[PDB]
Amino acid sequence: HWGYGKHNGPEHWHKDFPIAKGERQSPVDIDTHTAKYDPSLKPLSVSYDQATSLRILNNRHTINVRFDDSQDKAVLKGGPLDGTYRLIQFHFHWGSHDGQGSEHTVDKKKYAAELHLVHWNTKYGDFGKAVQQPDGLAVLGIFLKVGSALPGLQKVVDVLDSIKTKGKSADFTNFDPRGLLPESLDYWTYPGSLTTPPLLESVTWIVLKEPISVSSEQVSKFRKLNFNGEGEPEEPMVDNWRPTQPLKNRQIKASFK
Numbered sequence: 696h697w698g699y700g701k702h703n704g705p706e707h708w709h710k711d712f713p714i715a716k717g718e719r720q721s722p723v724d725i726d727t728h729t730a731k732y733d734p735s736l737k738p739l740s741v742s743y744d745q746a747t748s749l750r751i752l753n754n755r756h757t758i759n760v761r762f763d764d765s766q767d768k769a770v771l772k773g774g775p776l777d778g779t780y781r782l783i784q785f786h787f788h789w790g791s792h793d794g795q796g797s798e799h800t801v802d803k804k805k806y807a808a809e810l811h812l813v814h815w816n817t818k819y820g821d822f823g824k825a826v827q828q829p830d831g832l833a834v835l836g837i838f839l840k841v842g843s844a845l846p847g848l849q850k851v852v853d854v855l856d857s858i859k860t861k862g863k864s865a866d867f868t869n870f871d872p873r874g875l876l877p878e879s880l881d882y883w884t885y886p887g888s889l890t891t892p893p894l895l896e897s898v899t900w901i902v903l904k905e906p907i908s909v910s911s912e913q914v915s916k917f918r919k920l921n922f923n924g925e926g927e928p929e930e931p932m933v934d935n936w937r938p939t940q941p942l943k944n945r946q947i948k949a950s951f952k
């Protein structure tokens with residue numbers, strides 16, 4: 696099974712998922728000098744006040760917080776998007792040390808971690824239909840930068856010990872994801888893919904320019920998660936990021952002048 700090891704990591708994925716070498720792959724390097732302000736982008740609308748978190752899960756690849764997506768309780772709209780995208784889940788990618796971890800880079804700089812809030816196009820009816828379509832998904836990407844602790848994250852770090860090994864999950868109600876947004880919604884956007892298998896080219900990426908701040912101590916708790924299941928050889932869940940892929944014939948737009 697795919698993973699982030701020497702034998703099953705990003706360099707291997709193409710053998711089971713040949714779209715790994717496709718024309719709209721993610722993540723990418725964002726070159727801030729050449730991404731152009733686009734005036735046709737509408738205002739971005741992140742509306743998460745009625746979000747209903749359900750459960751948190753270690754799936755052997757990351758930790759993910761799943762939400763009730765039965766109605767428009769948490770949606771992303773505007774910016775490059777047409778129509779309404781419902782929030783389904785958020786997860787993270789992070790490194791074995793604070794100098795790497797993010798999937799997107801900005802002028803080749805890596806952050807300590809990246810948060811991905813995953814939304815699907817309500818016109819396709821559910822996540823599983825949506826993920827098969829070019830305009831099916833929208834992922835809001837937010838960098839984590841080492842500094843002051845973020846209170847908004849502390850409820851996640853606090854439960855990590857209960858989901859240390861793969862397959863483990865826990866109740867995770869009343870978590871408000873607005874606590875994971877920076878002040879600014881300035882963003883870059885480009886058409887891309889899922890950054891994990893099956894690497895489907897169904898994602899409009901919206902990557903916020905402003906990182907949220909997390910402490911060294913908070914990121915370290917992520918590093919005590921495990922890829923392995925209970926009682927197998929330990930394998931710390933670190934460096935669960937895919938390297939940047941070639942932009943090819945795509946445009947990164949900026950939302951801001």
Ligand SMILES: [Zn+2]
Binds near residue numbers: 696755756
């Ligand atoms: Zn898997």
